[PDB]
Scaffold this motif. Structure first.
Motif, PDB file in Angstrom:
ATOM      1  N   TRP A   1       0.827  -1.202   0.000  1.00  0.00           N
ATOM      2  CA  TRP A   1       0.000   0.000   0.000  1.00  0.00           C
ATOM      3  C   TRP A   1       0.865   1.256   0.000  1.00  0.00           C
ATOM      4  O   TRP A   1       2.052   1.197   0.301  1.00  0.00           O
ATOM      5  CB  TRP A   1      -0.977  -0.003   1.173  1.00  0.00           C
ATOM      6  N   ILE A   2       0.246   2.385  -0.344  1.00  0.00           N
ATOM      7  CA  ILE A   2       0.952   3.656  -0.473  1.00  0.00           C
ATOM      8  C   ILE A   2       0.821   4.473   0.806  1.00  0.00           C
ATOM      9  O   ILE A   2      -0.261   4.987   1.074  1.00  0.00           O
ATOM     10  CB  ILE A   2       0.395   4.470  -1.678  1.00  0.00           C
ATOM     11  N   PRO A   3       1.917   4.626   1.562  1.00  0.00           N
ATOM     12  CA  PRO A   3       1.897   5.415   2.799  1.00  0.00           C
ATOM     13  C   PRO A   3       1.793   6.906   2.491  1.00  0.00           C
ATOM     14  O   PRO A   3       2.293   7.360   1.462  1.00  0.00           O
ATOM     15  CB  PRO A   3       3.262   5.122   3.457  1.00  0.00           C
ATOM     16  N   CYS A   4       1.147   7.653   3.381  1.00  0.00           N
ATOM     17  CA  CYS A   4       1.023   9.093   3.226  1.00  0.00           C
ATOM     18  C   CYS A   4       0.760   9.704   4.579  1.00  0.00           C
ATOM     19  O   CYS A   4       0.076   9.113   5.418  1.00  0.00           O
ATOM     20  CB  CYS A   4      -0.115   9.436   2.257  1.00  0.00           C
ATOM     21  N   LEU A   5       1.305  10.882   4.804  1.00  0.00           N
ATOM     22  CA  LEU A   5       1.027  11.603   6.042  1.00  0.00           C
ATOM     23  C   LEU A   5       0.122  12.805   5.794  1.00  0.00           C
ATOM     24  O   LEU A   5       0.212  13.464   4.752  1.00  0.00           O
ATOM     25  CB  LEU A   5       2.324  12.055   6.701  1.00  0.00           C
TER      26      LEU A   5
ATOM     27  N   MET B   1      -1.997  17.483   3.054  1.00  0.00           N
ATOM     28  CA  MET B   1      -1.023  16.453   2.687  1.00  0.00           C
ATOM     29  C   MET B   1       0.410  16.870   3.073  1.00  0.00           C
ATOM     30  O   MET B   1       0.845  17.996   2.784  1.00  0.00           O
ATOM     31  CB  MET B   1      -1.106  16.202   1.181  1.00  0.00           C
ATOM     32  N   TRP B   2       1.139  15.965   3.720  1.00  0.00           N
ATOM     33  CA  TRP B   2       2.572  16.159   3.915  1.00  0.00           C
ATOM     34  C   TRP B   2       3.287  15.638   2.677  1.00  0.00           C
ATOM     35  O   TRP B   2       3.227  14.440   2.386  1.00  0.00           O
ATOM     36  CB  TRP B   2       3.061  15.433   5.169  1.00  0.00           C
ATOM     37  N   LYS B   3       3.936  16.539   1.939  1.00  0.00           N
ATOM     38  CA  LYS B   3       4.605  16.199   0.678  1.00  0.00           C
ATOM     39  C   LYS B   3       3.668  15.459  -0.272  1.00  0.00           C
ATOM     40  O   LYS B   3       2.597  15.972  -0.588  1.00  0.00           O
ATOM     41  CB  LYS B   3       5.920  15.424   0.939  1.00  0.00           C
ATOM     42  N   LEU B   4       4.050  14.258  -0.708  1.00  0.00           N
ATOM     43  CA  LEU B   4       3.205  13.428  -1.583  1.00  0.00           C
ATOM     44  C   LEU B   4       3.058  12.017  -1.017  1.00  0.00           C
ATOM     45  O   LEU B   4       3.853  11.619  -0.160  1.00  0.00           O
ATOM     46  CB  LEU B   4       3.807  13.362  -2.990  1.00  0.00           C
ATOM     47  N   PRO B   5       2.048  11.264  -1.460  1.00  0.00           N
ATOM     48  CA  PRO B   5       1.961   9.849  -1.090  1.00  0.00           C
ATOM     49  C   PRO B   5       3.246   9.173  -1.532  1.00  0.00           C
ATOM     50  O   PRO B   5       3.801   9.525  -2.578  1.00  0.00           O
ATOM     51  CB  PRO B   5       0.760   9.346  -1.891  1.00  0.00           C
ATOM     52  N   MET B   6       3.739   8.235  -0.735  1.00  0.00           N
ATOM     53  CA  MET B   6       5.059   7.679  -1.000  1.00  0.00           C
ATOM     54  C   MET B   6       4.956   6.499  -1.967  1.00  0.00           C
ATOM     55  O   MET B   6       5.145   5.334  -1.586  1.00  0.00           O
ATOM     56  CB  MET B   6       5.762   7.313   0.307  1.00  0.00           C
ATOM     57  N   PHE B   7       4.636   6.819  -3.222  1.00  0.00           N
ATOM     58  CA  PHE B   7       4.493   5.823  -4.282  1.00  0.00           C
ATOM     59  C   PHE B   7       5.792   5.058  -4.480  1.00  0.00           C
ATOM     60  O   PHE B   7       6.857   5.667  -4.586  1.00  0.00           O
ATOM     61  CB  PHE B   7       4.121   6.494  -5.609  1.00  0.00           C
TER      62      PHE B   7
ATOM     63  N   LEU C   1      -1.064   9.018  10.054  1.00  0.00           N
ATOM     64  CA  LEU C   1      -0.511   8.178   9.008  1.00  0.00           C
ATOM     65  C   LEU C   1      -1.648   7.431   8.323  1.00  0.00           C
ATOM     66  O   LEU C   1      -2.512   6.859   8.980  1.00  0.00           O
ATOM     67  CB  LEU C   1       0.488   7.186   9.597  1.00  0.00           C
ATOM     68  N   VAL C   2      -1.659   7.457   6.999  1.00  0.00           N
ATOM     69  CA  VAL C   2      -2.667   6.742   6.222  1.00  0.00           C
ATOM     70  C   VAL C   2      -1.976   5.924   5.135  1.00  0.00           C
ATOM     71  O   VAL C   2      -0.773   6.066   4.919  1.00  0.00           O
ATOM     72  CB  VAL C   2      -3.726   7.703   5.597  1.00  0.00           C
ATOM     73  N   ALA C   3      -2.732   5.041   4.478  1.00  0.00           N
ATOM     74  CA  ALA C   3      -2.212   4.290   3.345  1.00  0.00           C
ATOM     75  C   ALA C   3      -3.299   4.085   2.319  1.00  0.00           C
ATOM     76  O   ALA C   3      -4.453   3.842   2.666  1.00  0.00           O
ATOM     77  CB  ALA C   3      -1.619   2.944   3.774  1.00  0.00           C
ATOM     78  N   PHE C   4      -2.917   4.172   1.045  1.00  0.00           N
ATOM     79  CA  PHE C   4      -3.877   4.016  -0.032  1.00  0.00           C
ATOM     80  C   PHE C   4      -3.667   2.714  -0.768  1.00  0.00           C
ATOM     81  O   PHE C   4      -2.534   2.253  -0.935  1.00  0.00           O
ATOM     82  CB  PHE C   4      -3.790   5.179  -1.030  1.00  0.00           C
ATOM     83  N   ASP C   5      -4.778   2.132  -1.200  1.00  0.00           N
ATOM     84  CA  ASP C   5      -4.794   1.019  -2.141  1.00  0.00           C
ATOM     85  C   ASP C   5      -5.278   1.587  -3.471  1.00  0.00           C
ATOM     86  O   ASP C   5      -6.392   2.128  -3.540  1.00  0.00           O
ATOM     87  CB  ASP C   5      -5.776  -0.044  -1.651  1.00  0.00           C
ATOM     88  N   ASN C   6      -4.467   1.457  -4.518  1.00  0.00           N
ATOM     89  CA  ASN C   6      -4.808   2.037  -5.825  1.00  0.00           C
ATOM     90  C   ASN C   6      -5.718   1.152  -6.700  1.00  0.00           C
ATOM     91  O   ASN C   6      -6.239   1.601  -7.730  1.00  0.00           O
ATOM     92  CB  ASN C   6      -3.538   2.450  -6.582  1.00  0.00           C
ATOM     93  N   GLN C   7      -5.905  -0.099  -6.285  1.00  0.00           N
ATOM     94  CA  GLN C   7      -6.786  -1.024  -7.002  1.00  0.00           C
ATOM     95  C   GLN C   7      -8.243  -0.777  -6.633  1.00  0.00           C
ATOM     96  O   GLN C   7      -9.106  -0.686  -7.504  1.00  0.00           O
ATOM     97  CB  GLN C   7      -6.402  -2.484  -6.716  1.00  0.00           C
ATOM     98  N   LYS C   8      -8.507  -0.679  -5.335  1.00  0.00           N
ATOM     99  CA  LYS C   8      -9.821  -0.301  -4.823  1.00  0.00           C
ATOM    100  C   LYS C   8     -10.002   1.230  -4.876  1.00  0.00           C
ATOM    101  O   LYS C   8     -11.130   1.732  -4.742  1.00  0.00           O
ATOM    102  CB  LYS C   8      -9.974  -0.779  -3.371  1.00  0.00           C
ATOM    103  N   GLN C   9      -8.884   1.944  -5.085  1.00  0.00           N
ATOM    104  CA  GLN C   9      -8.818   3.416  -4.989  1.00  0.00           C
ATOM    105  C   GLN C   9      -9.523   3.948  -3.739  1.00  0.00           C
ATOM    106  O   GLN C   9     -10.544   4.633  -3.794  1.00  0.00           O
ATOM    107  CB  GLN C   9      -9.283   4.133  -6.270  1.00  0.00           C
TER     108      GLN C   9
END
Ligand SMILES: O=C(O)[C@@](O)(COP(=O)(O)O)[C@H](O)[C@H](O)COP(=O)(O)O
Ligand SMILES: O=C(O)[C@@](O)(COP(=O)(O)O)[C@H](O)[C@H](O)COP(=O)(O)O
Ligand SMILES: O=C(O)[C@@](O)(COP(=O)(O)O)[C@H](O)[C@H](O)COP(=O)(O)O
Ligand SMILES: [Mg+2]
Ligand SMILES: [Mg+2]
Ligand SMILES: [Mg+2]
Ligand SMILES: [Mg+2]
Lengths: 140, 465, 467, 228, 356, 140
Positions: free
Chosen positions: A38-42, A75-81, A107-115
């Motif tokens: 998953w894609i971490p993001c702050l 958003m802190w910077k960008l999602p850490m793709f 702290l959050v995380a994204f799933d790009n398949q389920k978006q």
């Protein structure tokens, strides 16, 4: 019979009913993000922008259903793709909280398949916050 | 070929074992029990005929049209392992047979008359293959799982709900009182019982008002978005809509509808209204078990779940597996995938008879509800994962310290289990230990654990694969 | 201390099994055919059914004390063993009238059949009957017109009505639909109808059909000098589409529409019935999907309950089965629910499946429709079973006639009138029916041709839905 | 794969010559004339990109979604016989890209911006494959040929029509006069000229009324159904 | 004028170059809902070009991610963001969900910056009824601006929408999707200047005008000509700019030109020079393609615009000194510096098809 | 990567993204007004009336589209019709800020042919304002 306190006992969605997470417990959650790809993001917000509110509905007709202010944070910077290194996430938590020591930070995380955001929890609250209780003071 | 008046076998027209199904055909799997002396080919053909174009004797009007184009076709028959007189008959229906966007019409053809034929002893519709070209004619669910989480701002764990109790008999103000105390303790949602509509002891609009006060009080208190499924189920479409309108005007997040007792026509209308006004629609499956309980006759729940996904709903009850109501694990996992996922491969070990392509129709949130309590939490999280709502009615309002402590106990249990899973723990094996650990720092959970320690629901399963 | 809140699970029977309860005349009563799991006492199983269809859940809740459970609880007040069954019981449950929303069949079903059929503690459950008390009956608008008003508006008396489903079920164009309709009506049928699954489809859109069928109705009416109708299907995916179709029928000035009440649903149906009352349209009800629910003896809901529900929700006609045709319906079972559909007061009679005396308190009677796999040779039995107050429908039995629709319609109309005359003259239709039909064949070539084609055709099978 | 800011060739993402088209994809056949120095693969890729998901430089937001799921794909390029600089570029668009029942939306994607790109000299959309799953989202024509013949009760020959002339300048009553005389002689239909709407010389409602008188006169006179 | 004549066998090609719309006909049109002066007045924005930005990727983003991108763009200094022309309502994102999340984003960014914000919510739809439902939702949310694809939606729908916008005080941004199907070739079709005049009559507060320097075609002189036809009250015949007729607009409000497509920070001096203050300049890729994200991207564009505006105001020649203006601004703006580095080499220079 | 701060980073329309204007830069803007024959004018507001807000919308039906409070500020004297002297404008800036030392003050100019304000920027903010950042603290 213990009584659940209505004062000042604000929560913060996922994991806020558990004891505050240790560094080891936070690291384990970060390992979970990376293990699953998953894609971490702050994200962060000043105290005034931290909890859901209604002020914009003053501009509305009868359309306030599922509208709330303060769901979006900054958003802190960008999602850490492409991030495959837990230590990198931990270092960004340090950098974010250092730049914004008085902000709420999650702290959050994204799933790009389920978006969709697939996980999230608070990692910092301002030390001036007094609208919340320690685990053993949630009931009296 | 001239018109020849008289009765002939259905199989002469409607049994086509060499037919290659089209990607736009609706397919049906029927568990069929013929009468003695009725060949399975004839019985399958009768089912295909009388759910599509045919009747009991030859009609001349066939010749004005193309029966080849329109007829339903029994194209395959499977024996059932372990049964002397049970068959799976497969029927293909051309897309032209169906009204676009109408679950009502689909059911009317496929299950309208055939279940009452004297020539069969029992019939059960096990599955339907809804082709993308038909899926695309439906508005579908108002929002769906992703949008729901996004509007609620809730991620990383199952949602928590709770039916207010007693089922009937509470006043409007006491309803709101119970609701506020439930929500403030950590539950995301509460709900009207399925049979709470408008009644002498509590009229609907009074309830909507008091519940609204409770939602907003608990939300302000906790800092978390709250909702309560206000029941729009009514005697008429006009009353149903009046109730939906009131919820819209109060700015609250969510209503509910009993889709089977209210009906598909009303439900589809309501789902559309919800899409147009941005209300969540929780679907209660009241009466499903009248239809779906028995192995030999009726309609399996997976078909009722597909039908609901098409007609529209953001939530649909899925069973608990472990609670007071029936639902075998493998059967349940199968239809849960059918409710949530975009593409589900054929898998007979989970009762999935056809590969189902939902062609981006939103997924429906499964709701696990009924006879569950804190000790069930590890199994529920393991069975459902995060994308479910878990509901504790009695499991909240039956807590010895009241609703808020009851809610806290459930929310603690959920979050402990979620954390444990995230850390690599095996919930199937370590679940008891996770709960016991959480009991050390949560007196609310400890009290819940003590009251319900011995309580299990383990019975012989009727709806077996 | 008096009765405090005590958290925890206890038996349902401690609260919901009340064998000494005297039922009130306003209570809704339910008769449940119940099959408990091994080790579950029938008293506990009946109590669970009563509890979970009224006020109770699986563990004790504190909120009970804010109200009066005695006032609101469902009560299992009697349990009957079933003769010939080791593990089947009739559990009788009384529900206070306060539990129900006025005028809402949807709400009544939601309580009584909402959740209890799925309980792990039981293996099977079937709702056999409901006693709907006058005080609850009176909250319903009920049927738009009813039998007496229907005959009065049609100006039709002294015989069964005759109908006919157009065939093939699907695949005909709008103009061919009207063509078939005209030819059927002009030969002596009172009504034709859309098939239950004819709504709006690529091969035939609804409004085109309504228009051509309207031309056919008025042509046949002018030709014959008898009032004609065709049940135009308002069944639809949404309430808005359903209403648009009803409105079009109103604006065309035609007599009758139809609705599939179970697939469309009670909420939509009640709305439509109310519209029909307010605009003077007849509402024919098709019971599509009933057999999914009502076929099996051990589980589901008997049709007699579905018929009572429809009468309350509203319909001028409801299909009743034929007894003798292609679809199941045992004679005694059928005669029982036919009375429940038509009559004002029906006494308890277990030999016809009537578990409760039912008082309809002047709610209009619903016209039974006997349809499905019937032909001219069935006529004597149909007239004998149903009497005059029924509509008999011959779809295949008309459009399958070797000479076409008008001769097919004439054959059916001749057979009906001959049987009616014979009955009126004192003849016994059960014994002399064959002779009545054969006599009519001598002066009716249309009837003779029908009789020849279907001479050998019978539908005789072992009955599943037995008392 | 991280976010890398900056411009890269469209063909790296949007030229997929090994793609097997799905039965639900909308397909487009573009007759494409690239500028000198623009490879046809890059030109076809640019057309696919800018009619689907892409823009001129890499955006970080791609990573929040699945570009593989949504992107338009130039999956084939044919040279045109007799042309040195003309190609048929084939593009596949996932059904998810389109609003159900909206021809407006379909055109907006497929022909919205790509015809104006500096990198091409000319572009022509020759054909579209509309898949059944998309066709089914449209109400479509009010009646269609069979229903039209059925309502008119006209079979076995072509229908006959006629535009009233002069195009503009006739009064409402003279319009109806011309219409009656046309219809009564054996034409099934007459019609307003395309540019006859509502104007100073003839307002629409006056015309509708006079034409209605003419339709019904000619119908009664001939015994054949008439329209205008 | 263009109904049948283009298909006549007797001709090989036909192109409508210009129309003289006389005041007496102009006066029969409601025209644009607001126009340039009213727009600036309601926004309280003066003294510089407006800044916009199309959200990307074009399709495939969820409603919440749309609002997320929108908030981050607006908060960095952009006045507007927008739905892509082809973002209407789709399986990956339904319109009403989008309108709601975008509304949250508009109000968040406005409160954060203290500047009025907007996002062009797309009302383009398959039917007039759907189009209106979308406009009504925008009205009820109290947001400033919607958009319409006037050519793909059509003039009948567009005129209706413009009248609704006038009656309810909504700004109407017009996207010219499909114009190049019609207006690209010199020998056949309809020149854009006619399509622009038609839009001005039908109604729109903004219309896309081309960039001259970006990824889509638009020759300088041609563009300057129709820009005047869009904005001004009276435009004299001038064949050197493709103006075949003197055009008197008889006080019909001017339409704001929108320069959009393939432009970035280095183009800023040329854009300001070409268009002046009365334009909206849009950076989609040029914002969402910034290496540090949307807010820094927006800030870089806003810094570049204000630097160029200041420089022009001081007497500097943007055509000659533009590079120096941008480089100077880079010294105190790390956001601009990072943008400048990424797009330094990027130009769009091709042989022009639509030549006078 | 630098992060654009959401706290307290309020802006003020035209030129607020540039470093604060020097006196020479302000004088150059005034020269621009005079060179073009535009009408200079000064406007001011107390801090509470400085930023766009929504309070009046409480009185509205569904008509809040493009309605905001605090767009209008208070006119200092009158627009300087006929002014062709930059020094005169500069002297009015001095006079206005002297009379209202704690107010926000902006210089604007009007074009009477287009009938619209044609330029504008802030020339004074109260020294008590802390809701804004210096150029080098806008990102962190
Ligand atoms: O009426 C009830 O029993 C419930 O309110 C649960 O109450 P408790 O939480 O107190 O058990 C739910 O409606 C059932 O779970 C429905 O069953 P299902 O979800 O299977 O359709
Ligand atoms: O679809 C059919 O089979 C019918 O049209 C009869 O056709 P035929 O007249 O050609 O037999 C009726 O709908 C059935 O009678 C319904 O069953 P029931 O009345 O039992 O509900
Ligand atoms: O879809 C696009 O390509 C854009 O969003 C620009 O995106 P970028 O900012 O990323 O380039 C605009 O719609 C074009 O400018 C339209 O062309 P025109 O203005 O000529 O009508
Ligand atoms: Mg319930
Ligand atoms: Mg039928
Ligand atoms: Mg013409
Ligand atoms: Mg675009």
């Amino acid at each position: 019979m213990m009584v659940w306190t209505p004062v000042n006992n604000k929560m913060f969605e996922t994991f806020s009913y558990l004891p505050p997470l240790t560094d080891e417990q936070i690291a384990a959650q970060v390992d979970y993000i990376v293990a699953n790809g998953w894609i971490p993001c702050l994200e962060f917000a000043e105290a005034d922008k931290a909890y859901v509110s209604n002020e914009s509905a003053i501009r509305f007709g009868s359309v306030s259903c599922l509208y709330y202010d303060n769901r979006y944070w900054t958003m802190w910077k960008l999602p850490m793709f492409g991030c495959r290194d837990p230590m990198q996430v931990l270092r960004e938590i340090v950098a974010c909280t250092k730049a914004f020591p008085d902000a709420y930070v999650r702290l959050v995380a994204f799933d790009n398949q389920k978006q969709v955001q697939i996980m999230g929890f608070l990692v910092q609250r301002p030390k001036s916050a007094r609208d919340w209780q320690p685990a053993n003071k949630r009931s009296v | 070929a001239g018109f020849k008046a008289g009765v002939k076998d259905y199989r002469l027209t409607y049994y086509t074992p060499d037919y290659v199904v089209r990607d736009t055909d609706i397919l049906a799997a029927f568990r069929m029990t013929p009468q003695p002396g009725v060949p399975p080919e004839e019985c399958g053909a009768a089912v295909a005929a009388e759910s599509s174009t045919g009747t009991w004797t030859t009609v001349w009007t066939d010749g004005l049209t193309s029966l080849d184009r329109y007829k339903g076709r029994c194209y395959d028959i499977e024996p059932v392992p372990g049964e002397d007189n049970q068959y799976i008959a497969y029927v293909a229906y051309p897309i032209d047979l169906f009204e676009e966007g109408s679950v009502t019409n689909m059911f009317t053809s496929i299950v309208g008359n055939v279940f009452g034929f004297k020539a069969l002893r029992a019939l059960r519709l096990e599955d339907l293959r809804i082709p993308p070209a038909y899926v695309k004619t439906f508005v579908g669910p108002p929002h769906g799982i992703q949008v729901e989480r996004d509007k609620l701002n809730k991620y990383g764990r199952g949602l928590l709900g709770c039916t207010i109790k007693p089922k009937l008999g509470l006043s409007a103000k006491n309803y709101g009182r119970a609701v506020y105390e439930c929500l403030r303790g950590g539950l995301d949602f509460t709900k009207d019982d399925e049979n709470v509509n408008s009644q002498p002891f509590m009229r609907w609009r009074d309830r909507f008002l008091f519940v609204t006060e409770a939602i907003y009080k608990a939300q302000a208190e906790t800092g978390e978005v709250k909702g309560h499924y206000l029941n729009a189920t009514a005697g008429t479409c006009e009353e149903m809509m009046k109730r939906a309108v009131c919820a819209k005007e109060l700015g609250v997040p969510i209503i509910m509808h009993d889709y089977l007792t209210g009906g598909f026509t009303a439900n589809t209308s309501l789902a559309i209204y919800c899409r147009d006004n941005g209300l969540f629609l929780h679907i209660h499956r009241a009466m499903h078990a009248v239809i779906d309980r028995q192995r030999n006759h009726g309609i399996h729940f997976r078909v009722l779940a597909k039908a609901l996904r098409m007609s529209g709903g953001d939530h649909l009850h899925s069973g608990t597996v472990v609670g007071k109501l029936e639902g075998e694990r493998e059967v349940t996992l199968g239809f849960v995938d059918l409710m949530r996922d975009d593409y589900v491969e054929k898998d007979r070990s989970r009762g999935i008879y056809f590969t189902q392509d939902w062609c981006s129709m939103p997924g429906v949130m499964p709701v696990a509800s009924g006879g569950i309590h804190v000790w069930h939490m590890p199994a529920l999280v393991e069975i459902f994962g995060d994308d479910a709502c878990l509901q504790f009615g009695g499991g909240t309002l039956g807590h010895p310290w009241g609703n808020a402590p009851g809610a806290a106990a459930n929310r603690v249990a959920l979050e402990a289990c979620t954390q444990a899973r995230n850390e690599g723990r095996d919930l199937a094996r370590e679940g008891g230990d996770v709960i016991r650990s959480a009991c050390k720092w949560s007196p609310e959970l400890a009290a819940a654990c003590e009251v319900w320690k011995e309580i299990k629901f383990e019975f012989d399963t009727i709806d077996k694969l």
